[PDB]
């Protein structure tokens, strides 16, 4: 479809949406209906799970009309998810906060397996582990 | 333009030049860097 | 500054600065800023250097100061007729022979030592040269 003439990501959570302040400009500077953004973000997330920030590649075609494809929930999102945490380390790698057994780093990997570069799925996990470390987490896998 | 006794690069886009023997740090960026003497 | 507290005498002969100082080889730290030319150092110069050397590397790292002033230097009050007794020690100094390593440094990457020492050297009246701690 049309490339990127008004294409950016986003950071709301679950099916939740609507405001301009956090990311309304993503459409606010575009002109596309922010309420169409609400109901339609739910056109995908009417079934999508809570408090796990899922970005949507806005897809406003080279002629105003659009579509969109959310990313499967982010790795950082699925770490706030798998760790039993709500936020990242108070101070990186020098401390931990929540565990993520690698079967989950892999399941999340199989979420990204259709939404990220790869060949070695446990290697995708290696990315999710560096992700786990950078953000500082109980590294247990 | 500076005319002080030091003169040496003031970024990198600054450049050494020896016109008439006199050293002049020309700068293809900041006009200010331009100087002389050395 | 860095004047010596107490002394056997409050004044001292001008003296001579010939010779090559013993404080040569690096001792404590990882580098050092060995002296090159010859000359004397007012204590305040040492302080001007220490700061404009310390601040150069923030509080990280470590700095030894191999030399000490101690030599008194008098001066005749302004517009004073000759003789009439020795002047008054306005300030202290250190006779510096070539090779008398001054600020030995340690704890930081070599490039930084070159960085700071270049500065403090700028403060100093005598020419200088960076030096790396040596194996025997």
């Amino acid at each position: 479809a049309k490339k990127v003439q008004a294409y950016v990501k986003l950071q709301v959570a679950a099916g939740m949406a609507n405001p301009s302040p956090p990311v309304g400009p993503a459409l606010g500077q575009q002109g596309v209906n922010i309420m169409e953004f609400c109901k339609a973000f739910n056109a995908k997330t009417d079934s999508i799970e809570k408090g796990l920030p899922i970005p949507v590649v806005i897809t406003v075609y080279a002629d105003r009309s659009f579509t969109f494809v959310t990313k499967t929930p982010p790795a950082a999102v699925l770490l706030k998810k798998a760790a039993g945490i709500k936020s990242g380390s108070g101070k990186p790698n020098k401390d931990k906060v929540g565990k993520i057994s690698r079967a989950q780093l892999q399941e999340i990997a199989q979420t990204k397996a259709a939404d990220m570069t790869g060949a070695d799925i446990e290697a995708m996990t290696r990315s999710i582990e560096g992700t786990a470390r950078s953000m500082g987490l109980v590294v247990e896998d | 333009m500076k005319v002080r006794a030091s003169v040496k690069k003031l970024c990198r886009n600054c450049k050494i030049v020896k016109r008439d023997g006199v050293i002049r740090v020309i700068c293809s960026a900041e006009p200010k860097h331009k100087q002389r003497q050395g | 500054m860095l004047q010596p507290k107490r002394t056997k005498f409050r004044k001292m002969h001008k003296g001579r600065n010939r010779g090559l100082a013993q404080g040569t080889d690096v001792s404590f730290g990882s580098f050092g800023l060995k002296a090159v030319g010859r000359g004397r150092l007012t204590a305040r110069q040492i302080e001007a250097a220490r700061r404009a050397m310390t601040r150069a590397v923030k509080r990280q790292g470590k700095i030894w100061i191999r030399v000490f002033p101690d030599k008194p230097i008098t001066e005749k009050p302004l517009a004073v007729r000759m003789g009439k007794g020795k002047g008054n020690v306005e300030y202290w100094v250190a006779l510096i022979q070539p090779g008398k390593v001054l600020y030995e440094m340690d704890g930081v990457p070599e490039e930084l030592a070159r960085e700071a020492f270049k500065l403090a050297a700028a403060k100093l009246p005598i020419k200088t040269t960076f030096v790396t701690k040596t194996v025997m």
Partner: protein, 94 residues
């Protein structure tokens, strides 16, 4: 592996020594074990580059002189007060 060429010194006076040092070569001495200590004039620069390496001040070294290869060690050195160049060397006839 470390190896140098050298010379039996002619005159050993401070003067001849000094100018010899000006001649890009400098006096060195070797002693130990038994032999009467031998004056060792030797080229500077080669030794200079050779010494930079820390190993030079610990390992066994081989010194040439008329074909003979004494295997001394670096016992000590006296450098120039404010210049990179050396000045004199002391060798334990390891």
């Amino acid at each position: 592996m470390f190896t140098i060429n050298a010379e039996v010194r002619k005159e050993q006076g401070k003067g001849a020594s000094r100018r010899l040092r000006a001649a890009n070569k400098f006096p060195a001495i070797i002693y130990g074990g038994k032999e009467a200590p031998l004056a060792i004039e030797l080229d500077h620069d080669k030794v200079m580059n050779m010494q930079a390496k820390a190993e030079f001040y610990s390992e066994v070294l081989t010194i040439v002189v008329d074909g003979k290869e004494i295997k001394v060690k670096a016992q000590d050195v006296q450098r120039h007060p404010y210049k990179p160049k050396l000045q004199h060397i002391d060798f334990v006839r390891a």
